[model samples]
Structure formats: C-alpha cells, structure tokens
Target: IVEKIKDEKSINQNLDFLRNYRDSYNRTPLMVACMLGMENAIDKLVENFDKLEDKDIEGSTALIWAVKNNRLGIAEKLLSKGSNVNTKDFSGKTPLMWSIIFGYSEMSYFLLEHGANVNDRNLEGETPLIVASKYGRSEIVKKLLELGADISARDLTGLTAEASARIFGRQEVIKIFTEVRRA
Candidate 1:
C-alpha cells in the first residue's frame, strides 16, 4: 500500500481515490504528485496539511520527493506546513542538495531561504551548488552563489563547482562563474 490515508480529498480529482493506498512505482498519490509535478493533485492532497509529512517506502518525505521532482509549489506548501527543510534521506541528501542536483532553481531558493544548510554534504561530499554546476545548471549555480553559497567548496574527491562545470563541458557556466569570482 502507498500512504494509509484515513481521510479523503476535498476535490474529486481521480487520483483522490488512490490517495489512501495508491502506490504506483512504490509511492503514494502525494508521492506521485511530487514525482510527476501534478500541481492540482498536490493542491488537493496538501489541503490536509497534517498528512503532508508522510514518507514513502524509502524513508523519503514529501519535501524530499518534491525536490526530487522539481515541484516548487508542493515544496512551498510542505515547507509552510513545518516540514523539516533539512531532513536528510537515508543517503544523507537533504532536499536542498536534491534540488540543486536536479536543477530546480525555485525549489533551491525556497529551501535556502527557509534555513536549509547550504553546505550540507551527501555521502559523496557533494554540495547542492556543486551538483548544480556539475549538471551545467548555470542559473541555479548563480542563484546558489548569490545566496552566499561557498564558491570555494569542494566535494569528496576535492572537485569544486568550477571543476564540475569544466568537466561537464559547460564552458558558458564556467565563464560566468569565473567572471563572478573576479568581482
């Protein structure tokens, strides 16, 4: 079963029925909403804010899934519900890291402002900014940097954000960061 919802959705969005125990791909309807970026479903499911904190089979919370799928609205809703912005998954990856690793700019900014640890490292010692630069997400990298992320932060292998951008052939991103650093 997915999430054992004891309540029903206020709206009758077909997925509402599945909200109780719908586990497709091993997740609940809310989990699905986070993974699929279904704003409407999220709007409906999160209406009952008390249930929004439920985690999936892998010890992942709604905020975690929202960040994983790049759902900014859902992340906001859950964050407002007092969700732990710094909750680390079994792999030690906080929502902030996942947002950067996946290039979710809005989510990243939200989490950062909500007191998420910008320097939180995963098992691989990868910070959110490092992951963003590693994936060539220049915009996200810029936002992270602008928000006071460590420009000189390194990863488990001693690779910095600049090195990641270079390794990924993101010359434009590398150039932007290089110039930003000069200022």
Candidate 2:
C-alpha cells in the first residue's frame, strides 16, 4: 500500500498502516523500499522494523537488494543501522561477492572495510577474487589482492585466480598474481 506512493511525506502519512505489514512477496516496507531504491522511503521505514535482517521469500536481505541494485546510499544506511555485512543470500553470495561479481570496486571495498569476508566462497567455491579474474575485472582483482585476498584460493574446479585469469586471457590480472607470487 505504502509502496504505491511516491512522495515520502505521503508515504509517511500512511506509515501507520505499514506496521507489521508484509507484502505478497514477504517483503516489509523497508525491503520493498530498498528493492525499489526509494531512498526517502528507506530512511523513513528503516527504523520501523524490529529486526534489521528480515529476509524476503528469496532469502535476500535489504542489504542484498541494495547491492544488487547498485544503491550504495541505501546500503550505507542499512549498514549503519547494523545490517550484517556478511549475510549470504540463498546462493551463498555475500554483498562483497555480489559487488565483485558486478565489478563495483568501490562497493566491494566498502564491504571489505565494513568487515565483509573477502574470502567467502559461493556455492561453486568461487571467491570474490576468482569472480573478478573470471570476468576480467583487473582493477577489482588488484583491489582484492591489496585487501589480503588469498592469491592461492581455488574454485570448485580447482582453478586458482591465476589459472582463471590465464583461461580468460586476462594478462593484467595474471600479471598481478604473477608479481605477487614472485614477491
């Protein structure tokens, strides 16, 4: 119901109706606002929820939606409100992993600084470093290395970051790993 309103104040006018409300998607107003990138609504509704870690039907928290949609401000707000930085969704992908998978180095770094597990593996055993290498995200690969990501980490197929980089012809990424090995 509140999701239909655009104006933050108008949404707030109906805010009383939203207490304990869960939409058909099992999403609270906060989750819906996060999913929709409604920054104002997010600010208003964030305080209404008793538990900040509520998951929707997909097991996705508001922080996950914020990362998935590239809403860094919303993510910051949620994190400041004590959202779990390392919470894994149904796929075992944390916000840090998602940020790397999507090539958002700033977001990845933000998560890392906020204590997200840099070495977290998804269902396939792919860490953020491996994902960045596989996607040829050179800058992300470099940042992950600088943040102490294991250079020797392997995926489920036993492919290390260097191996993954070589397989994809990512010379710059391979060079980063190679130089690290030599040191």
Candidate 3:
C-alpha cells in the first residue's frame, strides 16, 4: 500500500509518505528513492545514513541497487556513510557482481577500489571477469584482470571464463583474455 505512493512524482508528497516508512522491511525510504532514481527524494533520504546497508525482503542493501542501476551519486552517498561495498546478497552475489553483470564498468571499478572481492562469485560461481568475458565486455574484463581477477577460474558448471567466451561466440573476448601478454 505504502510503496505505491512512494513513487509519486512530487518530492514533497513522496517524502511525506517515505518518512513514515523509514524502517519498513529493514530498509529506509532512501533505498526506494534510489531505485526510483528520484534525485530530490535521494537528496532528502540520504541524510539518514543509518539505513545505508539495511537489507530488505531479498536481503539486498541500498548499495547493491545503487551499483546495479549505475547510480553513481547514490552509490557515493551510501559509500560516504560507510556502506560495505563487498556485501553479498543472500545468494552470495555481491554488489561488484551486479555491477559487472549489468556492464556497469565504472561502478565495478569503484567497488574494486573499495576492496570488493574481484574473485567473488554468484550462485552459479560466475565471477565478474567471467561474466564480462561471457558478454564480450573487453574493457571490463581487462580491468578485472588488472585488479587481480583470475582468468583461469571456472564456474560451477566447469566452464572457465575463456570457455564461456568461446561458448558465447565472442572470439574477440577470447583473444583479449588469452592474448594479454602477446608481443
């Protein structure tokens, strides 16, 4: 009932409803505001940093959404409040994984700089570099490797990052991963 109104366009109106649902689902209105990409709502809710890392129904923090959505400002706000960049969801997928899976390279770089585990894997054991390779995101794959990501790592299905690139028909991606030191 309440979440419906929080999406209202009017900042004042939305904030009014959000203020009342601050602690609902262990999440603050700020988390919802970021998901909705409401700049004004974010400005208002960010003042309450106590809920930066609050986990909701799926046990995801606001930082996860911020990274997943490429919301850099919201991510910075959460980070400034000491939110854990490396926090994994209930399924073991960290915010870093979300950033990479979604092709948010800058966001993934931010997480890596903040100590996010480059080797952190999802439920299927797919690391950021593996997903980047699978999706042919060469720049992200290079960045992940530069950050110590393991190119030889394998997923739960026994498919290596290079193997996923091959399976996905991404020849250029396979080249990038295998030809890193080629003169």
Per-residue lDDT of candidate 1, residues 152-181 (tens digit): 889887888898888889977897798797
lDDT of 1: 0.73
Which ranges of candidate 3 are over 4 A from the true structure?
A: 1-26, 39-49, 181-183
Q: Clash pairs of candidate 2?
A: none
In terms of lDDT, the best-performing candidate is: 2
Which candidate gets the maximum TM-score versus the true structure? Answer: 2
Supply the TM-score for candidate 3.
Answer: 0.78
**What range of 10 consecutive residues in model 1 has the weakest lDDT sum?**
1-10
- What's the TM for model 2? 0.88
lDDT of 2 at 44: 59
- lDDT computed for candidate 2: 0.81
CA shift of 108, model 1, Å: 2.6
**TM-scores across all candidates?**
0.72, 0.88, 0.78
**Per-residue lDDT over 75-178 for candidate 2, one digit per residue giving the tens place of the 0 to 100 score:** 98888888999898888888987887787777777888898887888899999889889988888888888889897888898989889899999988988887
The root-mean-square deviation over C-alpha atoms between each candidate and the true structure, in angstroms, is 4.5, 2.1, 4.1
Clashing pairs in 1: none
Which residue runs does candidate 2 get wrong by more than 4 Å? 2-8
Cα-based lDDT for every prediction: 0.73, 0.81, 0.74
